[PDB]
Each structure stands twice: as structure tokens, then as C-alpha cells.
Write an enzyme that holds these catalytic residues in place. Structure first.
Site, PDB file in Angstrom:
ATOM      1  CG  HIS A   1      10.127   5.190  -7.985  1.00  0.00           C
ATOM      2  ND1 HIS A   1       8.998   5.385  -8.750  1.00  0.00           N
ATOM      3  CD2 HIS A   1       9.959   5.919  -6.864  1.00  0.00           C
ATOM      4  CE1 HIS A   1       8.189   6.221  -8.101  1.00  0.00           C
ATOM      5  NE2 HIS A   1       8.746   6.551  -6.950  1.00  0.00           N
TER       6      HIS A   1
ATOM      7  N   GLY B   1       0.139   9.019  -9.066  1.00  0.00           N
ATOM      8  CA  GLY B   1       0.620   9.987 -10.048  1.00  0.00           C
ATOM      9  C   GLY B   1       1.389  11.157  -9.434  1.00  0.00           C
TER      10      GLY B   1
ATOM     11  CB  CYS C   1       6.145   9.678  -7.834  1.00  0.00           C
ATOM     12  SG  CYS C   1       5.459   8.328  -6.859  1.00  0.00           S
TER      13      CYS C   1
HETATM   14  C1  LIG Z   1       0.231   3.925  -2.914  1.00  0.00           C
HETATM   15  C2  LIG Z   1       1.328   3.200  -3.566  1.00  0.00           C
HETATM   16  N1  LIG Z   1       2.109   3.989  -4.515  1.00  0.00           N
HETATM   17  C3  LIG Z   1       3.201   4.667  -4.145  1.00  0.00           C
HETATM   18  O1  LIG Z   1       3.600   4.737  -2.992  1.00  0.00           O
HETATM   19  C4  LIG Z   1       3.993   5.375  -5.234  1.00  0.00           C
HETATM   20  C5  LIG Z   1       5.298   4.638  -5.485  1.00  0.00           C
HETATM   21  N2  LIG Z   1       5.193   3.251  -5.882  1.00  0.00           N
HETATM   22  C6  LIG Z   1       6.432   2.507  -5.486  1.00  0.00           C
HETATM   23  C7  LIG Z   1       6.564   2.229  -4.013  1.00  0.00           C
HETATM   24  C8  LIG Z   1       5.448   2.147  -3.186  1.00  0.00           C
HETATM   25  C9  LIG Z   1       5.579   1.889  -1.836  1.00  0.00           C
HETATM   26  C10 LIG Z   1       6.835   1.709  -1.316  1.00  0.00           C
HETATM   27 BR1  LIG Z   1       7.037   1.343   0.534  1.00  0.00          BR
HETATM   28  C11 LIG Z   1       7.959   1.775  -2.102  1.00  0.00           C
HETATM   29  C12 LIG Z   1       7.836   2.041  -3.463  1.00  0.00           C
HETATM   30  C13 LIG Z   1       9.095   2.102  -4.280  1.00  0.00           C
HETATM   31  C14 LIG Z   1       9.549   3.401  -4.452  1.00  0.00           C
HETATM   32  C15 LIG Z   1       4.983   3.081  -7.356  1.00  0.00           C
HETATM   33  C16 LIG Z   1       3.697   3.693  -7.841  1.00  0.00           C
HETATM   34  C17 LIG Z   1       3.599   5.198  -7.769  1.00  0.00           C
HETATM   35  N3  LIG Z   1       3.234   5.718  -6.445  1.00  0.00           N
HETATM   36  C18 LIG Z   1       2.289   6.686  -6.413  1.00  0.00           C
HETATM   37  O2  LIG Z   1       1.814   7.164  -7.437  1.00  0.00           O
HETATM   38  C19 LIG Z   1       1.776   7.263  -5.136  1.00  0.00           C
HETATM   39  C20 LIG Z   1       2.477   8.194  -4.374  1.00  0.00           C
HETATM   40  N4  LIG Z   1       2.012   8.731  -3.238  1.00  0.00           N
HETATM   41  C21 LIG Z   1       0.794   8.353  -2.820  1.00  0.00           C
HETATM   42  C22 LIG Z   1       0.032   7.445  -3.524  1.00  0.00           C
HETATM   43 CL1  LIG Z   1      -1.543   6.984  -2.949  1.00  0.00          CL
HETATM   44  C23 LIG Z   1       0.511   6.892  -4.692  1.00  0.00           C
END
Ligand SMILES: CCNC(=O)[C@H]1CN(Cc2ccc(Br)cc2CC)CCCN1C(=O)c1cncc(Cl)c1
Ligand SMILES: CCNC(=O)[C@H]1CN(Cc2ccc(Br)cc2CC)CCCN1C(=O)c1cncc(Cl)c1
Ligand SMILES: [Br-]
Ligand SMILES: [Br-]
Ligand SMILES: [Br-]
Ligand code: NA
EC number: 3.4.19.12
Lengths: 303, 305
Positions: B41, B143, B145
Site C-alpha cells: 500500500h 507511520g 506500517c
Molecule cells: C489509522 C489509520 N491508518 C492506518 O490504518 C494505516 C494504513 N492506512 C491505510 C488503511 C487504513 C485502514 C484500513 Br481498514 C485499510 C487501509 C489500507 C491498507 C494508510 C495510512 C497509514 N496507516 C498508519 O500509519 C497507521 C497504522 N497503524 C495504526 C495507526 Cl493509528 C496508523
């Protein structure tokens, strides 16, 4: 989101762990530059442990009575001295993996990561707090002496604990890296037999709010005096103005005045959880500091 | 004495973490030999993420679209491909700190250590379990991922998880290092919910054994049960079934304490039916289910790596 007991990455400390042998005893040492630090009780026999005279035990040793093993390599000891309850062995190789580091003596309530080690080899990492009674509730077995506790804020390893012994109650006692014990304890097998860390419980309630939960708040406030009078009845430590000050950033981020969170805690102590949890726990957690919460949680509240 | 949630030492994994940039996105990658692994992604814009055609979006990318930073050093990308939901970037430099490693896909109930990373820099380490519903209750911010989960099996780092996203409930979803999701999730920003979770029975039993090893015995009783009767109770209380394989896996802890698994099962049955009557076990008022049998043995026996 989420909230876990979160240790520091241990690699910088792993590269400093060695095995120290004196006679038939082996334990762990910390190799920084050209010095290895370890508990001075390495020089005791079993008999020596009730009333050791460390000066008399140590004078009888040469440099070559100490063996230091770093991985598969023997380091040669070229000097030794005792500082308080630590032994310092000068070795003829500086550790090339020495991180930026400092030694810090911590206060009760502070947390740190522990790298539990056996025979100079790391086994695992976990979080600990210095309890109000100057013990730590570690997880340590035979051979763990010389394991260390540390923080790594700002890419500097701050060493704050070296493990010396387990007390009869199963909790742990040790020194700072200058060899001074935390608490009244001594490196003797003699009889030398806690409260809840209030500021930490408050920090963790703030974490819960930051992460999106408010169910435990109420409409009340409290004076600091009344808060302490109540909380002490549940064997909570006194909350000081310093503690209130330290909670300021978490208060600002959540919009909940510190004394209002104190009112919430008073009510939790009175009521329990009614079958609910806070950040996955059914009891009030006291081994996350305010600084630990700011380290781990978002800077934006889930409102 | 003592019993803590304990992670593996993270140093071998720390030396593998890098920062990957594609356009305006930066996240973490895992650098092993001359390949960097990260979530696919990374190639998506916000708009793309809503309904990505990864085949097409990848076709539109070239080596020049990716930057990899290891500390203060740029690694030049000289090839790219995807395997399932993982992007693989071939780089011009083999990681000199590559540990002995394998990619292992774990089963629900198994635990692992997570090295939470931001901007390619390790920040923290904690212990998780793969839940029965194939989520993990991690601790991750923007950040994170590309952060990885691992075990150390003897002398070998077994990588088992790469972090992809957070679900609306605040739990986490990701893949094995071959890019296969755990659970019925997809790498798209669309509505997604995990099944109702259940409790990992074999792990609760392991932790009761830990409690006994550590001198906590109040919940022992004169009774035994059968596997069949125990499983009726498990099902009633939202616990996973206990299999004969689980009984076998608990064998070393049973041998060490001298308590048959079905004897301990009668303790657990009574705890489920009656609660703890105001008592705690290993300091907990909940029945803890994120220690495996092996986790208990590892901690109680001082296994090093
Ligand atoms: C909190 C929303 N953000 C996220 O889930 C992720 C992933 N997101 C894409 C995402 C998001 C929800 C879904 Br369902 C599918 C998809 C497609 C894969 C993009 C931004 C980066 N990102 C992060 O940096 C991140 C990771 N772990 C905890 C947190 Cl608080 C942030
Ligand atoms: C379990 C008894 N053993 C220990 O406490 C320690 C320390 N002991 C000395 C000791 C002992 C009790 C007191 Br009071 C003072 C002193 C100081 C003279 C020698 C044997 C090594 N040793 C360990 O290897 C060890 C560490 N942490 C947890 C566990 Cl289970 C063992
Ligand atoms: Br301090
Ligand atoms: Br510092
Ligand atoms: Br709990
Ligand atoms: Na029984």
C-alpha cells in the site's frame, strides 16, 4: 491506537552483555568501553554470603582470577576495583559496540526496561518500575545477577539498575551503576524484608481518555488534601504538587484538570469497574509514568 | 521468581529496519540481504487506497519511484516486484547485519514480539498474540506500517507479521512476510470488521500453570473433567475449543507441575462458572490468554538467544 507495556529496543544493551566468572560463580557483566561492571557478590562463596567482608575477599584476588567472556571471545582483565557494591574490571579490549550512555539513579515510581540475561546471553526484555519500597517486581531466575535496567530516550542509553538479589518475598533488589543499592538493602544474606504509585495510575487514566474512553469520569472535583486523605486509605502513595505539575501536559491534551482526574480515581477506588475494563485491564495499572504515556500515545485525543 | 509479559531481545531485528519512501508516503521496511520488504500500500495515494488496482498501480511504478534509507545512507533500488500484499525492493547493497532468519506463518493463539518503528527507526518492543479473529491488539500510531513481529526459534529469527493497518475498533491487521493477510481483511480503505473474538483456552491453561509454578494455588480443586465436558463449558464462555493437540502441547508444563491438563481444566471450568471471588492470579483479575505454553517454559527456564 492500543496501549501495551512497551520496552525500549534492547540491541544497544545486548551488545554490552558479557559473562563474568570468579571461582565457581558465573553471572552477567556490563561491558562499556574498557570496563566491565558486575555485582561484587561474584567474589563470595556460599559460606561468604551471611557476613562477607568484601575488602578481605577482594584483596586475595588477582586480575587473572576473573574471567570475562564476550560471545566466544575471552577478554583479559588488566585491573579491578570495587565501587560501593559493584565490581569494575578493566579489560584489554574496549567494547566496539558501546552505545552513547549515561548512568542515572532513579526515584520510586520511575520505569525502565530490563534485559534479563543468563551466562552473558540475553533472554528477554520487559518493563519494570521502581516500587515505592525500593524493590522491583522483576522476572529473574538463578544466573540473572548483573542483568541491567535502562531507558533509551533521545538515543542515549540511561542505565539505572543492576540486578543483585531476590528477597524472600520474591521481589528484586539491586543497585544503580555506581553500586549504591536502591532502598535499605545490603548484599548480605540477612533478613531485610509497598504502595500504589498514584501519579502513574492517573497517567494511565489520561492514556485511556487519549485513546477514546471517558466512562470513569464524574461531575466532581477534589482538593489535593482530600484526595490524599482518601487515597491513602487504599494504600496509595501521596500525590504531591510535583506530581500534579508532571501531569500538566496530559491534562492539557485531554481538557481534564488534574484534580478532576483525581476525583475520578477516588470514585473508581470506591466503586470498582462494574464489569468494564480500562485499556484492557480490570485493575488500576501503576507502572506507566506520565512520560511513558506521552511516549506511547497519540498527541491527538480521540474525542 | 516473578512473571512478566516478556518480549524477545530485539537487536537482530533492529539492524534490519529501514525507511521506504514512495512519493509523499514514508513507512518502514525490512532489509534482509539485498531485498527490502514493505506493505504494497506504500504505492497508493489516498484516492488509490479507496479501491486500488494494485496490478495497474504497480505497472505505473519504476525503480526510480522508491527511496530507501538505512540510517543516513541511501540504498539504491535496482528492482521491484510484489508478492501478495508485500512489495519487494531489490537494493544495491546486501544488509551486512542480516541475521539467520526464516519467514514463518503463525496460527491463532501464537504470540510474537513486535518491534514498533517509525521513519525506519525502532521505537519500542512489546509482546502480542494472534487473536482467534486474526487481529492483534497492538500499539501503533501513524507511520508504523511495515513494523514487524517475530520470534527467535533457537538461533534463528522467525519473522511472522508485518503491520498494514488499524481497523475501526482500534485493533491491528497485517500479513506474514510473504504478504498473505492474517484474517479476512484486504489492503483497501473500505469498511472492515473482524469477527467477534474469543479467548485462547490453551494459553489460559498455560498461564494457570505459570501461576502454580510461581506459588499461586488457590484455584486448584479435587475435581477433574473430560475433554468433552470441558469443551461444552468453553463454548458457553466464548473460549476456543481445547484439542488433544493442545493437551499434548501442555505436556511439559503438566510434567513440571505434576498437574494433569484435565485436572487444571477442572480449575478453569470452576473459574469460568464462579469467577475469582475477589482474588487475583499472578496479579491479574482477568484470565490472561497471551502466554503460550512455550512462553511459560521459556520464561520459567531462562532460555537465551
Ligand atoms: C489509522 C489509520 N491508518 C492506518 O490504518 C494505516 C494504513 N492506512 C491505510 C488503511 C487504513 C485502514 C484500513 Br481498514 C485499510 C487501509 C489500507 C491498507 C494508510 C495510512 C497509514 N496507516 C498508519 O500509519 C497507521 C497504522 N497503524 C495504526 C495507526 Cl493509528 C496508523
Ligand atoms: C534466589 C536466591 N538467589 C539470589 O537472590 C541471587 C543472589 N544470591 C545472593 C543473595 C541472595 C539473597 C539475598 Br537477601 C542477598 C544476596 C546477596 C549476598 C547469590 C546467588 C545468585 N542469585 C541468583 O542467581 C538469583 C537472582 N535473582 C533471582 C533468583 Cl531466583 C536467583
Ligand atoms: Br527519576
Ligand atoms: Br537522557
Ligand atoms: Br487485570
Ligand atoms: Na482439580
Amino acid at each position: 491506537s492500543g496501549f501495551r507495556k512497551m520496552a525500549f529496543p534492547s540491541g544497544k544493551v545486548e551488545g554490552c552483555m558479557v559473562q563474568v566468572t570468579c571461582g565457581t560463580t558465573t553471572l552477567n557483566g556490563l561491558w562499556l568501553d574498557d570496563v566491565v561492571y558486575c555485582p561484587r557478590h561474584v567474589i563470595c562463596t556460599s559460606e561468604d554470603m551471611l557476613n562477607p567482608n568484601y575488602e578481605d575477599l577482594l584483596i586475595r584476588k588477582s586480575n587473572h582470577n576473573f574471567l570475562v567472556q564476550a560471545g566466544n571471545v575471552q577478554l583479559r582483565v588488566i585491573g579491578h576495583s570495587m565501587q560501593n557494591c559493584v565490581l569494575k574490571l578493566k579489560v584489554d579490549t574496549a567494547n566496539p559496540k558501546t552505545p552513547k550512555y549515561k548512568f542515572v539513579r532513579i526515584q520510586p515510581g520511575q520505569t525502565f526496561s530490563v534485559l534479563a540475561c543468563y551466562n552473558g546471553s540475553p533472554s528477554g526484555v520487559y518493563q519494570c518500575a521502581m516500587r515505592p519500597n525500593f524493590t522491583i517486581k522483576g522476572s529473574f531466575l538463578n544466573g540473572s545477577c548483573g542483568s541491567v535496567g535502562f531507558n533509551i530516550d533521545y538515543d542515549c542509553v540511561s542505565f539505572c539498575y543492576m540486578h543483585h538479589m531476590e528477597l524472600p518475598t520474591g521481589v528484586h533488589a539491586g543497585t544503580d551503576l555506581e553500586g549504591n543499592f536502591y532502598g535499605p538493602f545490603v548484599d548480605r544474606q540477612t533478613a531485610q524484608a509497598d504502595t500504589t504509585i498514584t501519579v502513574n495510575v492517573l497517567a494511565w487514566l489520561y492514556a485511556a481518555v487519549i485513546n477514546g474512553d471517558r466512562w470513569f469520569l464524574n461531575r466532581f472535583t477534589t482538593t489535593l488534601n482530600d484526595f490524599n486523605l482518601v487515597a491513602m486509605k487504599y494504600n496509595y502513595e501521596p500525590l504531591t504538587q510535583d506530581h500534579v505539575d508532571i501531569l500538566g501536559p496530559l491534562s492539557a491534551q485531554t481538557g481534564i484538570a488534574v484534580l478532576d482526574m483525581c476525583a475520578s480515581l477516588k470514585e473508581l477506588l470506591q466503586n470498582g469497574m462494574n464489569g468494564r475494563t480500562i485499556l484492557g485491564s480490570a485493575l488500576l495499572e501503576d507502572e506507566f509514568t506520565p512520560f511513558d504515556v506521552v511516549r506511547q500515545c497519540s498527541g491527538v485525543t480521540f474525542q
